[PDB]
Amino acid sequence: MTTVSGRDAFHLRVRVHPFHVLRINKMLLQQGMRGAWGKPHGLAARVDIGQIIFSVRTKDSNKDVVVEGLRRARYKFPGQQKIILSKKWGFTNLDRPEYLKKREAGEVKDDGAFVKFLSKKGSLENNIREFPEYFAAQA
Amino acid sequence: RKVLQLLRLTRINSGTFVKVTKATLELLKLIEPYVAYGYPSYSTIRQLVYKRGFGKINKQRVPLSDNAIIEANLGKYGILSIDDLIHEIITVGPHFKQANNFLWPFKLSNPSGGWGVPRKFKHFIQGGSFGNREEFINKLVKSMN
Amino acid sequence: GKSHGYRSRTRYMFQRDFRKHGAVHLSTYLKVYKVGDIVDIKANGSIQKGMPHKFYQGKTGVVYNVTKSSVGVIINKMVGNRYLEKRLNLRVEHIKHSKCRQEFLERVKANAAKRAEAKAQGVAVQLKRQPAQPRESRIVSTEGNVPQTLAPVPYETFI
Amino acid sequence: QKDAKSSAYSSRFQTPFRRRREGKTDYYQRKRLVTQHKAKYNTPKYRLVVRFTNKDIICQIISSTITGDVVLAAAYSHELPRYGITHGLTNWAAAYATGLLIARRTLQKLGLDETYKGVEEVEGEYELTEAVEDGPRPFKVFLDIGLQRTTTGARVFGALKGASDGGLYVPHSENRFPGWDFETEEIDPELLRSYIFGGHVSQYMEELADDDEERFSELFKGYLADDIDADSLEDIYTSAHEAIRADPAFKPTEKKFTKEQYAAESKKYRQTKLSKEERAARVAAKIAALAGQQ
Amino acid sequence: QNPMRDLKIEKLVLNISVGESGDRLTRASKVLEQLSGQTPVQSKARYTVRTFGIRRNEKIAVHVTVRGPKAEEILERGLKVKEYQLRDRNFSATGNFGFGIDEHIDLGIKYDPSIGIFGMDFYVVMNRPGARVTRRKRCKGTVGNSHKTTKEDTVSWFKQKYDADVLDK
RNA sequence: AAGCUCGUAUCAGUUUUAUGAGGUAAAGCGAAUGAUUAGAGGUUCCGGGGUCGAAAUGACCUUGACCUAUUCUCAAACUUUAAAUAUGUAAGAAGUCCUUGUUACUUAAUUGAACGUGGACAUUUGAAUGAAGAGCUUUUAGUGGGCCAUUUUUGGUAAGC
RNA sequence: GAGAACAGAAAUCUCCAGUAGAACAAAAGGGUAAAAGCCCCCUUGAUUUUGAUUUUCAGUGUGAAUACAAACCAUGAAAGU
RNA sequence: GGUUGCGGCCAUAUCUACCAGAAAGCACCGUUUCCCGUCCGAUCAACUGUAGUUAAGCUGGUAAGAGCCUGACCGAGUAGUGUAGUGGGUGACCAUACGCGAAACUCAGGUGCUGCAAUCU
């Protein structure tokens, strides 16, 4: 990713955390199968079918470069992983048409890298202070 | 296994009539892999009862060869001919319990002409034998009778 | 080694219901119990005295005794190939009238009554329950309901 | 106060029973007054409920039902003008009278009134009303103090004394009547009688009279107005018992306007709330108001 | 608006955090007795702390609580000692306030060298009428938002009688 | 194995209807506990290192800690929710209703509680299906190394473990 | 959290918020808020007799436990416990 | 209809903020001889109902309010599951047949009901 397109042209996210601990029993005469409960050996991620492993956001310009990162990446994992390109704006959600309708409306406020969505639910007062752009004369 | 027995089906190719209601429908569900069933026609019932109708009379299994035998056990409910019997079966109706029980389990042969599928133990919907094949029970029973 | 205390395995069974901890409301102490009543046993783990052992959780028996603070209950328990008769002294916090004996008594009345109006009309009754029956013919109309025809749908990813 | 409650805090929060929230009912006590021995079946435990407001004494014989408590009879110190008392309507003496009244009142309606006189005499000596032989056991009742503190000399046990002397069986003990000496472990019945007839108010009236015409005049503005001289308090109460025993029956107030008429005014000072549509309109308006930064 | 709800001292609490048990603490307590005209109450240490020299459940300090007109007189005496000047800290967010004096002889009080000299905390809590609502056994409740004491309100109360100075921020 | 007492009965490795119990699967984590990625904003007027008058009991810093609203991801010994399969009881003559007898229990109380007399109600008498008969007693053999398959499942890299 | 001489991160003193985030000998789990927690007052029901019952079960023993009966006591205004 | 006493169910009842409340009630509120309890008549006890006030309590209203409740072919007949095959697939796993069927989500509506006794323009 970085060399072909730059230290900065993408956001790569490992979407899977290796919470499960593996054990080795571990044979040092020999003791046996007597009391064989293992010691902790390593960690792993328990992954499902259709479960996402990596996600990447870039600019449309960079699609091909991106796919090749993730294609180069497979060769490091057991199993079959597919590269799917998504209808969805970046890491948000909402297909780009529905995200766009929103951003061009004021309903979206930039948070820390991610984003905050105008609700029709809290107090009128402080949703007005939170999303001024949404209810304003404005262009 | 219990259901098969409570429905008097403790031998391969033996067959009986069941009145359909919820309390019996859930029985047929439990049993579905082990039976073939459907909606019998008058024709089929007429011939099942004529050819292989036997009655239960002090345990013993007795061929219905004269109407006197039917009247002597089923007369008390109306039903004094073999056609009185067929009618209480096909129309279901008020003494169906008692009429139907008097009829011993029908002992059919294997079907003459075959099962028409390569494998019986799948569902009729899946290529054949077992489960409710609906109207198509007549064709099957006729070849077994 | 292994462990089989009296309240073994009971962490979720004797726990109180979510947001329902604390004092037990007085209704529980106002129910009256009679010999021959049918109660359902269900432990209240906030009351440690007069408490059913966990085998009897979820079981229903008959009252055979009434005492200052408890009823005695008869449960039939299967041990081996045979039921043994068991009697329990449960405090009242752990017991509750069986609601189905109530529908039943209600119906027995309903039944007596149906029988009455039938005789004082001199007609047939029919008092026993039939199970759900097959369903009789209908004519469905199409006025305002011309059938909408559907087809299967193409695969698609939403991710 | 920036002590804001997280939505999680509120969400898992389990509320006390309503009457607990509102500081009125002790449920630990209630379980123990109300609950009946299981093999006495539907025999009601009956409580003598006694409460004090700032101006009235409530006295109720209550019993329990899943669908709510049930009152057998009630008596209120506010009734006491009917029988001669017009002041000190929450003092010990009235507590005693009210307990007497409730006693004679309920067991009138019970049939039990002639058999079981009570005391009639009154020197305030310790005694329970004990059962006739070859006749009905007395009507039995258990003091419900509510949330009141058990202090030795409390008003609440005045109502107990009147009601016990009234012929009710109300189990109790001397050690909270005024006149109990903790050193002596005895009860000076002289003192207790004095309270029954108001001695403690009466002696004060005299002391104050002689030592402060002015303060005596505010605290006893009433007695002055009615020419009630102080050393006739005992008569007032003594004659009040007579009256009460003579005629405990309940006569309800004479009642200007009907429940209906009351209804049509009496909280059509009640704010009526909006329909989900008016609310919407208010919503849409408020925005148009608020929209535009500042 | 303002009729009932005036604002006043609930109580005055004089505290001498003595620091040890024995003669010195019994001596300090005498100061509170001979001043409040009440009999004072002794506090025990919540836990041991080696470097302060106190053992858990050892009596370390005495205080005494005062109310009505007498507490108001002792308050005045204290203020005198600090020349009617307190600081804008001093006042709690919830409407109370306090200060301390070194040497108690600075408010009346002879010298009696068998007693000695003690400094002391002064804490005065403010309420209104109707506090009983939150203090009584039956139907314990909370005082309304309006009603209920605040740092602003009670600083201004205190400037306004006492003719005093708050200070700093 | 021997029978015995009876004879359509109440039976039943089953359904239905009614009414209970349960905390697994799944689900959840901008819900409690515990874990975990990322920024954002605001706090410290009470942890700290500077530069600005050594100045600092004074400012703007970046750095913790903490707070708010978000964000990605998890649990056999976490959870609000919560299945499917399994599971308890009931569906009446030992029932129903009316009358009023007994007691030393119980009640303020012939009031309740139990148990009864006398009177009334048998076509479907109180869902389904079946019953090859139901109930009961004594006595005694062998056995007390088990193994396999689908499914659930634990230890183990695994195993014809 | 906001406040008070010596007083400090930490001594004692107010006030506010506070569903239990505490405490309940001990492992853990359950349970508890005018309490089952904390402070105080009075106490020996940790007593007497001998049966029934639940768990483990052979429906033997043992340990433990539940509800009564008949005594004698404790406490409390009392219901009660 | 209001209000009080005793309640049933125990948030549609709780939380936060702001309003409003006639009448009676309830309350706050005045007092310290007496019984009684405090470091402190604050609480607890007693006394007057007299001097005062609806400020608070309390009741009700407001709120694209936090929570709680209810509904829905909202999601979803999805996840999971009982039963079937000499079904697919190297396997991981998956599809079909007879059935059962969620949770989160979304949106809509709602914010105490009620028993006994007393009292009130």
Q: DSSP 3-state assignment of A68?
A: helix
Is the CB of A82 inside 8 Å of chain C's CB atoms?
no
CB atoms within 10 A of CB B58: 6
CB atoms within 10 A of CB A66: 22
Is the CB of A50 inside 8 Å of chain C's CB atoms?
yes
* Partners of residue C70 in chain D, C-beta under 8 Å: 38
**Tokens matching residue A31:** 């003791």
**Tokens matching residue C49:** 């005295």
Residue that has been written with the tokens 């909370």 in this structure: E142
93-132 in chain A: CB under 8 A from chain C: none
Which chain E residue shows the shortest CA-CA distance from D23?
E139
Q: Specify the DSSP element, H or E, that contains D265.
A: helix D259-266
Which chains border E (3 or more CB–CB pairs < 8 Å)? D
Distance D293 CA to F71 C1' (A): 28
> CA torsion angle for D31, D37, D38, D43 (degrees, to 10)?
-100
Nucleotide nearest to D153 (CA to C1'): H35
Is the CB of B20 inside 8 Å of chain C's CB atoms?
yes
Distance C19 CA to F89 C1' (A): 29
Cβ(B144)–Cβ(B44) below 8 Å: no
Is the CB of E4 inside 8 Å of chain D's CB atoms?
no
* Partners of residue C31 in chain D, C-beta under 8 Å: 66
* C/D interface, count of CB pairs below 8 Å: 46
Q: Which of D283, D292, D293 lies closest to A124 in CB terms?
A: D283
* Strand F nucleotides where any atom sits below 7 Å of a protein CB: 12-24, 30-33, 35-36, 38-40, 68-75, 79-81, 87-92, 95-97, 106-109, 112-115, 121-133, 155-159
Asked whether the beta carbons of residue D146 and residue E141 sit closer than 8 angstroms, the reply is: no
Which chain A residue shows the shortest CA-CA distance from D293?
A132
HSE-up of residue C123 (Cα within 13 Å, Cβ side): 9
Instruction: Report the length, in residues, of chain B.
Output: 145
Is the CB of D293 inside 8 Å of chain A's CB atoms?
yes
The whole-angstrom separation of Cα B19 and Cα D33 is: 60
Cβ(B135)–Cβ(B124) below 8 Å: no
Q: Is the CB of A115 under 7 A from strand F?
A: yes
The whole-angstrom separation of Cα B142 and Cα C6 is: 64
HSE-up of residue B125 (Cα within 13 Å, Cβ side): 4
Which chains border B (3 or more CB–CB pairs < 8 Å)? C
Q: How, if at all, do strands B106-107 and B14-15 pair? A: antiparallel
Distance A19 CA to F34 C1' (A): 13
The whole-angstrom separation of Cα C87 and Cα C75 is: 6
The whole-angstrom separation of Cα D207 and Cα D203 is: 6
Contacts of D17 (CB under 8 A, 6+ apart): C23, C25, D25, D27
D282 to chain A nearest CA, in Å? 11
**Helices B42-52 and B82-90: angle between axes, nearest 10 degrees:** 140
Q: Is the CB of B58 under 7 A from strand F?
A: no
Distance C7 CA to F108 C1' (A): 46
The whole-angstrom separation of Cα D94 and Cα D100 is: 9
Resolution in A: 4.3
The whole-angstrom separation of Cα E89 and Cα E97 is: 8
In order of C27, D43, D107, the CA distances from D63 in angstroms are 13, 10, 15
Nucleotide nearest to A37 (CA to C1'): F155
The whole-angstrom separation of Cα E166 and Cα B112 is: 114
The whole-angstrom separation of Cα E160 and Cα E169 is: 18
Helical spans, DSSP H, in chain E: 23-36, 68-81, 151-160
The whole-angstrom separation of Cα D143 and Cα B65 is: 89
What values do phi and psi take at D118, rounded to 5?
A: 120, -130
**Helices D92-109 and D156-165: angle between axes, nearest 10 degrees:** 40
Asked whether the beta carbons of residue D31 and residue C19 sit closer than 8 angstroms, the reply is: no
Q: For residue D231, what is the DSSP state?
A: G
Q: Which of D17, D28, D35 lies closest to C29 in CB terms?
A: D35
Q: End-to-end alpha-carbon separation of chain C, Å?
A: 51
Nucleotide nearest to E148 (CA to C1'): H56
* D/E interface, count of CB pairs below 8 Å: 11
The whole-angstrom separation of Cα E97 and Cα E125 is: 7
Distance C6 CA to F161 C1' (A): 36
In order of A130, D277, D289, the CA distances from D282 in angstroms are 21, 9, 10
Q: E strands of D77-134, at which residues?
A: none
What values do phi and psi take at E9, rounded to 5?
A: -65, 130
Q: How, if at all, do strands C38-41 and C95-97 pair? A: antiparallel
What values do phi and psi take at E63, rounded to 5?
A: -140, 175
Q: Is the CB of C138 under 7 A from strand F?
A: no
Residue that has been written with the tokens 């571990």 in this structure: A26
Is the CB of A84 inside 8 Å of chain C's CB atoms?
yes
Interface residues 99-118 of C with strand F (CB < 7 Å): 99-101, 103-104, 107-109, 111-112, 115
Asked whether the beta carbons of residue A50 and residue C158 sit closer than 8 angstroms, the reply is: no
Handedness of CA C127, C129, C134, C138 (dihedral sign): positive
C128 to chain B nearest CA, in Å? 14
Is the CB of D147 inside 8 Å of chain E's CB atoms?
yes
The whole-angstrom separation of Cα C129 and Cα C146 is: 39
**Tokens matching residue E105:** 């002889």
Asked whether the beta carbons of residue A124 and residue D293 sit closer than 8 angstroms, the reply is: no
* Partners of residue C27 in chain D, C-beta under 8 Å: 66
Q: Is the CB of C84 under 7 A from strand F?
A: no
- List residues bridging with B56 in a β-sheet: B61
The percent of chain C in helix, strand and coil, each rounded to the nearest 5, is: 20, 20, 60
**Tokens matching residue E70:** 């007498």
C126 to chain B nearest CA, in Å? 13
B23 to chain C nearest CA, in Å? 6
The whole-angstrom separation of Cα B27 and Cα C5 is: 42
Is the CB of D286 inside 8 Å of chain A's CB atoms?
yes
Give ∠ CA A119-A121-A122 in degrees, rounded to 5. Answer: 100
Asked whether the beta carbons of residue D22 and residue E139 sit closer than 8 angstroms, the reply is: yes
Experimental method: cryo-EM
**Tokens matching residue B36:** 């073939």
HSE-up of residue C137 (Cα within 13 Å, Cβ side): 1
